[PDB]
């Protein structure tokens, strides 16, 4: 038979279900989600670190000319200077007033400790949904994970559950993230091929050990002004270091739902957001015939003490009468109220007491033991402990906060003001006939 | 768990109270005051005889 059913997303937090078949018992179904993952897909852009520069040993020629040429190597800036006199600790290495003239080239290159350093910029699209359930029935439980998307079945004991999809769709992941040394950053990287100096991604690489690379950190030469040979760069801070200093927190301190967030899939985990539909499809051999099932008779409750407490504090208890030795299941069909344990003994004229827990005050609802049926209802107090950190509003709050006694305040206090103007135009034609008469 | 009462300030005469906790049955509460003791601040001014 198959029974559909909504779930709250969020871990911890077991859902009761029965299923109802004519000749045979009520089958308590039991649903928890185990955990979360919502694993979007992502392409690597680029990958980006601190950088160093490459300044080889200046060209010259003694007594003659030169000129500048082109490479193909990351941010080359190459510039000429007529008129140096290189000089060394051997003393004067060209020797010719003002000819010789001196070539001077500079680039930069990922250092090499950036094997560990490296930040990647990564693009998120198509955010998908990987739920773990884990279903009892009959003190039998079974396990399954299934995608969110209700068109692929799971497989468990050759069993076929489908699942979603999601009510309102959720994704703390922006189109633009970046990702360092195992921490996940929210920023609006620039594009590959798209460079400016002083700010992230000054320098951009398909691959950390891609001997192609694209680049420009304003690097400008200056003319040397000493005695000696020397090639003196200027160039802006590295980038990589000032988005470091102020890069921001993390997405840890600031994914909503409490979403923990793992890099190297770079997925999100067991994080509560939205209602789950799922079908269950349970075989028919599960199912237990009404003729062995224990019958019961004159069932009534007795509510000890309520607490209107966030945690199951309530307490209820329930007088049977039976005739057969065995075990029923019972459950609260008003969703307000869940109770503790689902099957339960049955003696010929026992009595046992339940755990349940609410979410409003006027705990009044339908308990079903067995097969039968008993309504009825009681009144709980505000708890005087007034946080915890426990599974709470196992049922959300359905504005039945309203007290019984706070209806019929609200209830009396109207009033029929429209039956007075209504008695008034009786009595007004009632008198314009007496006029008639006069 | 937490529990007020007002006492009579009297040796020998034992108080019973409650503590009402959902899901707890009533706990009795007896407290018996052994003894009092007044005790005030005193400076010795002189002696004499
Ligand atoms: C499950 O409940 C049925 C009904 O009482 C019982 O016969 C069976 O032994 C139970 N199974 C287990 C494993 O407890």
């Not at 897909?41 to 160093?52: G, L, R």
């Not at 001196?102 to 198509?126: G, M, R, W």
């Not at 690097?219 to 003196?232: A, D, E, G, Y």
């Not at 199912?287 to 004159?298: A, D, K, N, W, Y």
Request: glycine share 6%; proline share 6%.
């Amino acid at each position: 038979f198959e029974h559909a059913t909504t779930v709250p997303n969020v871990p911890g937090i077991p859902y009761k279900a029965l299923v109802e078949r004519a000749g045979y018992a009520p089958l308590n179904l039991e649903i928890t989600v185990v955990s979360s993952e919502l694993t979007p897909s992502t392409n690597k852009e680029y990958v980006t670190c601190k950088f160093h520069t490459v300044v080889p040993s200046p060209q010259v020629k003694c007594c003659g000319s030169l000129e500048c040429k082109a490479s193909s190597k990351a941010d080359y800036t190459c510039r000429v200077f007529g008129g140096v006199y290189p000089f060394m600790w051997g003393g004067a290495q060209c020797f010719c007033d003002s000819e010789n003239t001196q070539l001077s080239e500079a680039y930069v290159e990922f250092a090499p400790d950036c094997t560990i350093d490296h930040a990647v910029a990564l693009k998120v699209h198509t955010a998908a949904l990987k739920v773990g359930l884990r279903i009892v029935y009959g003190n039998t439980t079974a396990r399954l994970d299934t995608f969110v998307n209700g068109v692929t079945p799971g497989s468990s004991r050759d069993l076929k559950v489908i699942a979603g999809p999601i009510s309102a769709a959720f994704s703390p992941f922006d189109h633009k993230v970046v990702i360092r040394k195992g921490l996940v950053y929210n920023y609006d990287f620039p594009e590959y091929g798209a460079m400016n100096p002083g700010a992230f991604g000054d320098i951009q690489a398909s691959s950390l050990d891609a001997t192609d690379i694209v680049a420009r950190t304003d690097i400008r030469l200056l003319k040397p002004s000493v005695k000696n040979i020397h090639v003196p760069y200027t160039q802006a801070v590295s980038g990589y270091e000032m988005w470091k200093n102020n890069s921001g927190r993390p997405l840890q301190e600031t994914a909503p739902f409490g979403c923990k967030i793992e890099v190297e899939p770079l997925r999100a985990t067991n994080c509560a957001y939205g209602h789950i539909p799922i079908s269950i499809d349970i075989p028919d051999a599960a199912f237990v015939r009404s003729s062995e099932s224990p019958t019961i008779l004159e069932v009534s409750c007795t509510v000890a003490d309520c607490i209107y407490s966030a945690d199951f504090g309530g307490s209820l208890t329930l007088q049977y009468k039976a005739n057969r030795e065995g075990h029923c299941p019972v459950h609260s069909h008003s969703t307000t109220a869940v109770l503790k344990e689902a099957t339960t003994h049955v003696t010929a004229t026992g009595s046992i007491t339940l755990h349940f827990s609410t979410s409003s005050p006027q705990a009044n609802f339908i308990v079903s033991l067995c097969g039968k049926k008993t309504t009825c209802n009681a009144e709980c107090k505000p708890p005087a402990d007034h946080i915890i950190g426990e599974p709470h509003k196992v049922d959300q709050e359905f504005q039945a906060a309203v007290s019984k006694t706070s209806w019929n305040w609200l209830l009396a206090l109207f009033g029929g003001a429209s039956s007075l103007i209504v008695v008034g135009l009786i009595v007004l034609v009632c008198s314009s006939m007496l006029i008639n008469t006069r």
